[PDB]
Ligand binder design. Structure first.
Ligand SMILES: Cc1ncc(C[n+]2csc(CCOP(=O)(O)OP(=O)(O)O)c2C)c(N)n1
Ligand SMILES: Cc1ncc(C[n+]2csc(CCOP(=O)(O)OP(=O)(O)O)c2C)c(N)n1
Ligand SMILES: [Ca+2]
Ligand SMILES: [Ca+2]
Lengths: 813, 813
């Protein structure tokens, strides 16, 4: 569970010292100066004579606008951390403000501790300034390469769901979440404000949202800066906050005076947080109004007010570079030089180029430093889950009654296994669900915990399995669920979420950002220790969207995830739970894994169980397997066709086609694929099947009928250099279906058992089996018309039980 | 331009008549009866003796919970439309309340007009009940197959961006937008409330958001129903609404009394809307507080209160079916029978099984009916745009200086063309951007229009090109931009939006829903006429994300769009603008198209122009072409290698590699691909290249080096059955890059000009070209060291001009 760090939720009980605040102003001055140097300066970081256009970067890249306001907040937050001993992680929503977070880490000393070549002297500063957004150097954003970051803020919107995930089961943590006012325009951010109804102030930490109301985005004003101030406070109050508002920088108020006003507001806010935390030790059943700060300052604060007659400070024009180039003209260079001198760096750095002791005496120390706090590198907190014995959850009936036994709903087995994970690991594992945890059948967890709910309660007739603290959280928002789990992982904990397959797409771009975080981490950030994997049960899938139809039919998250499988990063798993025992084999592997996104595609509908647990774990190891017990062919050379499947429903249809083919005396081999990436080119992926193993499973030269859960294009793109790839006939989802029967869903996508029997026969010998093909094609129409006449499927389809099941016996019928 | 329909914004000036209200209660009762019949009954719709379990559907599919609340609001909306002659489209947020939208259309008489077999008598009604969510019947949701729908509501979240897009430039239209309280938990819905700062009450219509606060989602209460009522009102007021609340159904109040209170509230709300509209004719520069309605009623309203001892009315338990089976026991069947009787259908239908005249005398007639209004079938409003002459925008320099001339920023040309489309079609065409309109270089439109902004103004030094009415809209939300445009198309108008390439994935699931909407329509909804296409400029793309790095590098919308290319639907366009002339060629074609989603991938960075407009149109017709002026091989059999490209940057790299291969004496053919689906299997796609045309462009047997803009997996899966596909060496984006130089971006993805020259030589004869290959690989290293050392790219990379340009002539370089 999360460490208790420092002395949490302690009041100052004294005014902030004049000396601490002179410190904060020096910090702000040197952070701004560092921030400008990074964007503008390729050499001569301290402007030693002569300081010339020659010292300016050729391509100016970086964002000034947000930066001075981030520097101001971070200096004040550092002062606060130090005075109070407060366990603090920031979330920099405007992550394009990267130079604010690298400057922080440089100033707190974690930069040089982590990057020993970047030294606390003039030569380290020259390197520091040059490498920023520079080839061979470091990103423009508050990237994973920077100590103190758990949130890059490149794709906007996710600041609040990450802040709130972070504080979950983390009662000593405080998260100042800085939210851009443009970012507050996004849908994910807008809903993220409401997270305060889903945390508990005794058993979780505290989020202080800070709206960075600097009044502009790239080329527009922001909605929230331009509505009435009274509508702005009502909005936040309506969302369960106590809004406080600070305005500064719009007139000639001297900076010390601003710091004094701000530190005093900050302490009042903090007193209120401390009251909330103390009350919560006694009463954590009535939701408080949590403070939030409206921080209203001019965008680009402290840069030149006007440049070439254009308003710059306090404008969208300051967004990127306020001085657009300083290499082109003498006069532009001069504006740059005067801007950098305005911070009076000769008072901030010693003759050696180190920042002075009196600039940083106010800073926190040790693990309370923003860049050093372990919650910002949660891999160092994460330990292996204590897992229950996998064998305890096995579907034992395959071993007793045969392959293909039963009508289990597979995800219930993951339900029972996860419940015992939670029991063994209280406070370290969460489930999230956009109002679908019971619908995906994970509700066995309610035997040991509850849905966490901190809005009103009204009656034991409707409020079941909810309590103000619990390890399951639901809100109808894929953004919140994904974001909450991401940050729970990044702070060193574990969990799973589930979603209807088609709506996983709502968060494709979040999956992309988390994959890229992981890709960068495993490639070049070895100090950022492995975090637990983001595990996503993809269920209520395409083939069985019973109550819903066409808009709910989209298994293409497979396609999106394939765009993050390069370079042997291994940060993606794509799995098809063939049945419940395969689902156990996949879950155990994913729950042990670290630094991945695992999509575990599994059916919640009644279905056959194909494999014993031992057989599933053996299959999963390579990722695909022949099923000798299912094949009529004695070896590869004798197979007339390969019947291959990935997905619980494709496997069902392939299995049923295999019984029909057996009846016709066909010789064939059955293959099952459970890990999509086992099929990937062996030269791109050093964990995939070797060309030799692949040819052994699929044959060097027989026709391969492959029934795929998602879009056929996935498999086609993947196997393009594999032996025998030209003999693959890949069937998959084809954008057909509606509100219908199970048979009809497979029929209209050409993947039903009958069509599969026909296809195999056409691939073997079309003229010879022409009458058999024609009669299967007619039966497809007879079975559809049966569904239309009757409202349920043909008994040939529903009553089929694989020939492998002992239907002579007890409870096998 | 939108039709002015009826007599808009008129007050009643009298109480609603007791008679109109008895009609509303009857509508409510018979719509409830029709909704239950659809969910539960396969025959005997009027419960004629004997009425038994045999009349009940074997599989109960559908959603009751939201439905009686929808039916109530719709009866009352129907009374209001009749009484006022008000041009009205509803948005059904809880689109799973399909039975209400179908019930509505059956009642207003549109269903029988559109579906003549579904008659208004017993036999028609039996068919109506049976077909609902049933194999061979109609969907579970308010699908495009329903008259009156322009919003399915399958994936929740979009009710409000659609409502607001629908009213833009549509000053007589009124949109009651019904939003689920669960749906309001989603990111996209939460930011949609803010659209009231982006519309104008004189030049646009009026949305009335109606929060369907029934207290539950699937398995949970809802946040907004369980916070204090005082917070609920502050929240809506802080977002610029005047909130009004109605509560009913929680006690024994009789129904007529509920209807009287509601009609009175509705008229008061309406009078405030009429005042807002009348004031707006005089003062439209001060934003009003727009009414919204909080409609708080028990979920499942009017179903049995308890079933089997469980609370059902006023519970999440009523979400799907409140009575889970009505075939299993006599007792359950009996509950269904009593629930059906409780509406007294013996008073609602005549002996013929037609709904009686007194039930519906209060209803609206003609084009004002919810099902008949042309805004709910915008294709009948849409006319072709008046396009300016394409040749006016041509980059003429190619014709004068040669292929490869210049350093134009291609999207500026589209910007100029779009400016004059707006000028020629004022009030009929819009540009949307998530704060990226000027960034993607579409700003020439500000010469004929302005960004629409209805929040505060402060100063002409920051407020440029903004006006309270205008044809460009920006908010930093891809869900808002896509949603506004969708509904602007669905109501018969035109436009375009632009996005950074990587952040298109934010709205992948909106693209999916809209593509499924177009798929169902082109397949089987001939009466829903063609709407203009959803055109998306995808720019600031992966190869040139200069200010930004790795989070901004993801061209994978291509891969998402390929999952919607089946069945010859032709609802997807995927285009690569090779240069500004191809961009013109693509745009013209997109702007003329209907019933599509067009992705237009185009570069905003400085780049060569390859083609004349005539050549670009010619290539685009077929989608791919050989470039004979660029080839050294005289015909195919003499080609040593084919150099193929898709995308402006791949084309640039290929062309520079081709100048290098010329110098080495190599004989090669150069191919360009502008339309990705030109490559699709000719069995799947009847507009694709036939295999002959394909083999003729790509050769039947020579090596094919293909530089692709996006992920290589796309192209490989597409061409899996094409002749010569095994000889394709496809390079594309590979999840590498950071904040770095143009050359470094292509190098690290193995698609730079030097690596491509090397791959070409490896493919022809690795041993003969060993030295040259080795020299090319050393130079990739040297060109990167030069970027690290200097901060900009090697003059060999930077200074290259295609040998096809006449550099002798004065203005060519
Ligand atoms: C989802 C998403 N869309 C678009 C962008 C492009 N973008 C980068 S910065 C920015 C403006 C951000 O403004 P704000 O949230 O106000 O930050 P600030 O004024 O502090 O720099 C935009 C639109 C993005 N980064 N993320
Ligand atoms: C984006 C999205 N996620 C999940 C679902 C699954 N879903 C369908 S209905 C529903 C509950 C919605 O409740 P609400 O908006 O309160 O509608 P109502 O109570 O009026 O039936 C959910 C979660 C969905 N349709 N869309
Ligand atoms: Ca801002
Ligand atoms: Ca609801």
């Amino acid at each position: 569970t999360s460490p208790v760090i420092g002395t949490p939720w302690k009041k100052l009980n004294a005014p902030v010292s004049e000396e601490a605040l002179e410190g904060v102003d020096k910090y702000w001055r040197v952070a701004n100066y560092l921030s400008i140097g990074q964007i503008y300066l390729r050499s001569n970081p301290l402007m030693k004579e002569p300081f010339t256009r020659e010292d300016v970067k050729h391509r100016l890249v970086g964002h000034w606008g947000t930066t001075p306001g981030l520097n101001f907040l971070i200096g004040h937050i550092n002062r606060f951390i130090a005075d109070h001993g407060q366990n603090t992680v920031i979330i920099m929503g405007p992550g394009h403000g990267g130079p604010a977070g690298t400057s922080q880490s440089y100033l707190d000393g974690t930069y040089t501790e982590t990057f020993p070549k970047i030294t606390k002297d003039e030569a380290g500063l020259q390197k520091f300034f040059r490498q920023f957004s520079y080839p061979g150097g470091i990103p423009s954003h508050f990237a994973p390469e920077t100590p103190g970051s758990i949130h890059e803020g490149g794709e906007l919107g996710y600041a609040l769901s990450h802040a709130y995930g972070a504080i979950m089961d983390n009662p000593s943590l405080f998260v100042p979440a800085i939210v851009g006012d443009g970012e507050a325009e996004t849908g994910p951010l807008a809903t993220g404000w409401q997270s305060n109804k889903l945390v508990n102030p005794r058993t979780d930490g505290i989020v202080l949202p800070i709206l960075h109301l600097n009044g502009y985005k790239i080329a527009n004003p922001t909605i929230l800066s331009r509505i009435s101030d009274e509508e702005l406070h009502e909005f936040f109050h309506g969302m369960g906050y106590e809004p406080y508002e600070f305005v500064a920088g719009f007139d000639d108020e001297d900076h010390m005076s601003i710091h004094r006003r701000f530190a005093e507001l900050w302490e009042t806010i903090w007193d209120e947080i401390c009251d909330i935390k103390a009350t919560a030790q006694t009463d954590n059943v009535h939701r408080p109004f949590y403070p939030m700060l409206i921080f209203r300052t001019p965008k680009g604060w402290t840069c030149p007010k006007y440049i070439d007659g254009k308003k710059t400070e306090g404008s969208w024009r300051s967004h990127q570079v306020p001085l657009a180039s300083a290499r082109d003209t003498e006069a532009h260079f001069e504006v740059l030089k005067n801007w950098l001198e305005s911070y009076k760096p000769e008072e901030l750095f010693d003759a050696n180029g180190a920042v002075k002791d009196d600039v940083l005496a106010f800073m926190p120390k040790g693990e309370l430093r923003i860049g050093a706090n372990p919650n910002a590198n949660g891999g160092v907190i994460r330990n292996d889950l204590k897992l229950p014995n996998l064998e305890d959850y096995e579907v034992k009936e395959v071993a007793e009654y045969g392959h293909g036994w039963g009508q289990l709903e597979a995800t219930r087995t993951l339900g029972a296994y996860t419940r015992d994970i939670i029991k063994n690991n209280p406070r370290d594992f969460r489930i999230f669900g956009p109002d679908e945890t019971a619908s995906n059948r994970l509700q066995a967890s309610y035997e040991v915990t509850n849905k966490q709910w901190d809005a009103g309660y009204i009656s034991d007739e409707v409020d079941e399995h909810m309590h103000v603290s619990g390890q399951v959280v639901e809100q109808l928002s894929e953004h919140q669920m994904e974001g909450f789990l991401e940050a729970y992982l990044l702070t060193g904990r574990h969990g799973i979420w589930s979603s209807y397959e088609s709506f996983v797409h709502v968060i494709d771009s979040m999956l992309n950002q988390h994959a890229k975080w992981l890709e960068a981490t495993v490639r070049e950030i070895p100090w950022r220790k492995p975090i637990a994997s983001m595990n996503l049960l993809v269920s209520s899938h395409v083939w069985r969207q019973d109550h819903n139809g066409f808009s709910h039919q989209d298994p293409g998250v497979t396609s999106v995830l394939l765009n993050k499988c390069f370079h042997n990063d291994h940060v993606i798993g794509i799995y098809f739970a063939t049945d419940a025992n395969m689902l156990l084999a996949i879950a155990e592997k994913c729950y042990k894994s670290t630094n991945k996104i695992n999509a575990i595609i599994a059916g919640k509908q009644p279905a056959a169980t194909w494999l014993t647990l031992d057989e599933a774990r053996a299959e999963l190891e390579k990722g695909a397997a022949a099923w000798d017990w299912a094949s009529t062919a004695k070896n590869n050379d004798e197979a007339e066709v390969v019947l291959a499947a990935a997905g619980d429903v494709p496997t069902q249809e392939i299995m049923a086609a295999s019984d029909k083919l057996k009846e016709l005396g066909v010789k064939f081999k059955v293959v099952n694929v459970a890990d999509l990436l086992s099929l990937q080119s062996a030269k791109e992926n050093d964990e995939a099947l070797t060309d030799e193993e692949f040819a052994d499973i699929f044959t060097a030269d027989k026709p391969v009928l492959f029934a795929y859960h998602s879009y056929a294009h996935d498999v086609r793109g993947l196997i393009y250099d594999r032996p025998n790839h030209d003999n693959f006939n890949v069937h998959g989802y084809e954008e057909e279906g509606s509100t219908t029967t199970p048979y009809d869903m497979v029929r209209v996508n050409r993947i039903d058992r009958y069509e599969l029997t026909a296809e195999a026969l056409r691939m073997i010998d079309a003229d010879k089996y022409a009458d058999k093909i024609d009669e299967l094609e007619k039966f497809r129409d007879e079975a559809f018309q049966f569904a239309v006449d009757n409202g349920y499927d043909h008994p040939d389809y529903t009553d089929w039980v694989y020939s492998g099941v002992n239907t002579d016996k007890k409870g096998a019928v």
